[PDB]
Amino acid sequence: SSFSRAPQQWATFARIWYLLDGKMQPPGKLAAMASIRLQGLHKPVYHALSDCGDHVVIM
Amino acid sequence: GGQWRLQQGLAANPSGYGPLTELPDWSYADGRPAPPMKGQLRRKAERETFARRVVLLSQEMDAGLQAWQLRQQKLQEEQRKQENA
Amino acid sequence: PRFVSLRAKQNMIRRLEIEAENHYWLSMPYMTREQERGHAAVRRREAFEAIKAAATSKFPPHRFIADQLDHLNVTKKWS
Amino acid sequence: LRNRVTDRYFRIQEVLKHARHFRGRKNRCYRLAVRTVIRAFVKCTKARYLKKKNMRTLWINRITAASQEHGLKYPALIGNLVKCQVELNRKVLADLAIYEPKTFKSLAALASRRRHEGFAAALGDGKEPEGIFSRVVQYH
Amino acid sequence: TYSPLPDDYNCNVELALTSDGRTIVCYHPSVDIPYEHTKPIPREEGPMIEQLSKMFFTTKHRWYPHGRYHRCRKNLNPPKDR
Amino acid sequence: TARGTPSRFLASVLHNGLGRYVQQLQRLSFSVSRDGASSRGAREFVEREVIDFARRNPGVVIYVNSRPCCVPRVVAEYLNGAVREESIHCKSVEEISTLVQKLADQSGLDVIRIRKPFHTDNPSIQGQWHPFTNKPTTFRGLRPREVQ
Amino acid sequence: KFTRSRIPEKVFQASPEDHEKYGGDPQNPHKLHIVTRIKSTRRRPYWEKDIIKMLGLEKAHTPQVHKNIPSVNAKLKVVKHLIRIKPLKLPQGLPAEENMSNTCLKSTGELVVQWHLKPV
Amino acid sequence: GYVPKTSLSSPPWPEVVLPDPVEETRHHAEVVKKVNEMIVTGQYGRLFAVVHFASRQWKVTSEDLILIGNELDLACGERIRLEKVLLVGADNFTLLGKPLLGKDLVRVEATVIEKTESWPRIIMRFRKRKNFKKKRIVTTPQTVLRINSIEIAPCL
């Protein structure tokens, strides 16, 4: 709180790089977590048109 | 989650009876209570005609059995008063 | 081909349970059939005499002088 | 023609003020614009139900996301807040999830606390003292 | 030693009922980031559309333009709020 | 429809309830024909109800023009310079009174669509969610696969 | 052919296991039913549609009070799959004319004749 | 009765041991005393109430607006005490009732600003090949409320 308008807006919709180690993991159960973080469905700010997806790095 | 609310005697829908829907929503800032909500007046009319029906049906049940007992007692008096002379 | 899930079995079962309790509470009447007879004949007769009475009291409404003359106000003007 | 119709520009223009933003000849020609304008009004009224529906699934997506931030799942949160007689709705919980995430964190703590009292109460079965947050406020 | 959520990262949540048992008092002041948990401050159309795509991690299609019918349907004075 | 109509956000005129409440309706302009069957209910409104109405809110200045009109009008002007011209054509006095009280009670803002049913200007009190709320920090600010 | 279905009388005879299951007493039974339509009369025969109209159950999920007499029980046995029956239990008395307006039928099945909105 | 530690020996969730009600009711007494000191000494900043005004829950601070889809039959300018406030939050504490808060605890005031009608709102029905085309135009009445103050009281 007490940010200005522009850095609050930048802070909320800024997108976050996640790392995700896929050793000995099943591909669909990685794919579910990756898919949620790619759509932005792990954010409470989520909306489809608002474009709040993130980056998932799967190693 | 309303089956829980049925376990507790509450309305199954929290918008049913109870404190969220039957207190007044607003008052004056002086403290004068508001005129009543339209749905609360309608709803109390529904509850009162329901209560009138409960009382009405109860009284027809009770007067029904009392009149039957008069018919049975007077049948037995017509039995015993015709076994004579 | 259509198959039966667990939703459908649990739903069907809770309808069967509501049904079984309907069977229970219909199994103990407060009166016998000899006791109930004529126990509400008066109220049923007065109820139909009200239906009968509202049926046989149908007629045109009253026509008034004041309505017909009150149409003359369509040319009320100022002075 | 004894009385043919003078006032026909205005019937056309009653339809075509609704079509001024369409594509193709639907914004211009009355025969095409009537079918599309009618069809737009039918969609416009059937979309009231879909506005309500899509807001509610949007709120469940936002409550789902914000409660997965605190480890809970959505059925756990909503169930065990009903069980606390916190009769907030989905709109308010989604808006607290966005704008007041400490109140949402404390509601997630109240719902997981109630969830664990439901576990420990329905584990050690029999007559026992009830949980502290498990108590209900009787209204008479 | 029980904590219903790991009161570590957002706010220190401390639930309470009152004596009547009717209101739930939550007490939750903010968790400051420790000083130990911080780093010091360090001191043509084709290839342009591929370069913007790869810069901003989006596809190519939002960098191609659009026609006048789409540029003039746009609301240039949209309503503001807050 | 909503996509053909313009829309707006819910607002006030000059924060109209915060300090005091100001009646947003400045002028009414009735124009009533003397001889004319369409302004009959306007005539009986000027004779019966417009003086009582003009006393129930004295910040409203009311002009009854009373020219030969063929349709009578009421022209509400608002403090923010909006003009709502409505007709009182072939209306009863009671329908005109509910219309004039309708124009009195409202403000000059458009009756286009309102987007949200609310307008906070400070929606967030505990601080709005950014993706580093609800995350724990690490020792010395490290990220994944950071050695030192 | 699909016809009207009689149901035999052994179906409507309680067992003491059922008196242990539900909360009933075979001696001194209840006077008033609460009947509630919970399954549509559409895709049902026209006779069941009629019995739902007679019982006053055209709205779903709205309770209706009936007598526990064998005629009303006969109509209820026709449409027992569409309805729900509970005994009207009355913890305090039936309402007198003082308590006539301030009642509330609760979801348990009881009809309370003093309905405050204050917690206990 | 012993099972050796296999995969499926224990349930997969870790067990929580919920605290005993003696020290827990004492702990709640400490917390309510703290929060009641914050309400007494005025430590809080601005509040937000969740108010079950009308038929829905409005999350509300002071100095804002609510558009309600019915005429309340009040004059424009009239102050209103909104009962049925059911959450009240500040920066460092909240208060939530079961389901409602005490009227002696929270007081939420609001004036009526304007009593408008809605934008005209079309209701069209159309079934194809049946010559079924109805059209209605509906404006519902609406009032706008300006929430003036959420005043809080030390009654815990």
Side-chain angles (χ1 to χ4, degrees), chain B residues 4-73:
Chain B
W4 185 76
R5 295 184 185 94
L6 292 178
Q7 305 298 324
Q8 312 292 314
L10 295 169
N13 194 358
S15 72
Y17 61 93
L20 267 177
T21 71
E22 300 186 3
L23 275 77
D25 288 334
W26 64 273
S27 300
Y28 293 94
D30 305 336
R32 302 193 303 277
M37 311 289 286
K38 303 287 188 178
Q40 188 64 36
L41 297 176
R42 171 189 59 84
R43 193 185 297 118
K44 286 173 71 178
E46 297 171 354
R47 292 189 176 108
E48 190 167 354
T49 66
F50 185 82
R52 298 284 168 86
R53 193 168 203 266
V54 168
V55 168
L56 192 277
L57 298 194
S58 291
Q59 293 185 358
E60 291 188 355
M61 297 285 271
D62 292 330
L65 285 184
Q66 294 175 3
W68 181 76
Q69 286 178 357
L70 293 182
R71 292 199 299 271
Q72 296 297 314
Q73 287 176 358

Side-chain angles (χ1 to χ4, degrees), chain F residues 75-95:
Chain F
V75 179
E77 298 192 0
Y78 287 85
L79 275 169
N80 55 356
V83 177
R84 301 274 83 86
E85 186 170 7
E86 287 188 354
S87 71
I88 52 176
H89 183 81
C90 282
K91 287 178 177 178
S92 57
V93 192
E94 297 86 5
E95 221 287 335

Side-chain angles (χ1 to χ4, degrees), chain C residues 18-32:
Chain C
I18 292 167
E19 188 73 36
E21 194 171 1
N22 283 337
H23 283 70
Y24 179 65
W25 296 107
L26 293 171
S27 298
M28 43 181 70
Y30 185 80
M31 297 187 183
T32 59

